[PDB]
């Protein structure tokens, strides 16, 4: 059971190479080609969601899930999922 106030974000790799994932000031695990990895943070707020060649100012609201599509050299897409 996740604690109330926490937030989730999916680092989706839409490219064909490993991407370096890091949200805000936290270094996260790399994501495999055409793969994805779910991450979570206790403290909600606005963070810089860097995913390899992409970097989006993804705001993480409390008690909410996010899916971030990172497409190197293409167009990224953030999806909110309360």
Rounded-to-integer distance, Cα 59 and Cα 9, Å = 10
Backbone angles phi, psi at 37, to 5 degrees: -145, 130
Contact 66, 80 (CB under 8 A): yes
3-state percent helix, strand, coil for the chain, nearest multiple of 5: 0, 50, 50
Q: What is the CA radius of gyration of the chain?
A: 12
What's 28's DSSP letter?
Answer: -
Q: How was this structure determined?
A: NMR
- Give how many domains the chain has, as a whole number: 1
Rounded-to-integer distance, Cα 8 and Cα 66, Å = 6
Rounded-to-integer distance, Cα 31 and Cα 22, Å = 11
Residue 53 pairs with which residues in a beta bridge?
none
- Domain interval for residue 42: 1-82
């Amino acid at each position: 059971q996740a604690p109330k106030g926490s937030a989730f974000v999916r680092a989706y790799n839409a490219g064909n190479s490993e991407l370096d994932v890091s949200v805000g000031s936290t270094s996260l695990n790399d994501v495999a080609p055409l793969g994805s990895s779910d991450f979570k943070f206790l403290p909600p707020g606005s963070y810089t969601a860097q995913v390899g060649q992409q970097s989006l100012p993804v705001k993480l609201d409390p008690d909410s899930y996010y899916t971030l599509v990172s497409q190197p050299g293409g167009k990224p897409q953030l999806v909110a999922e309360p």
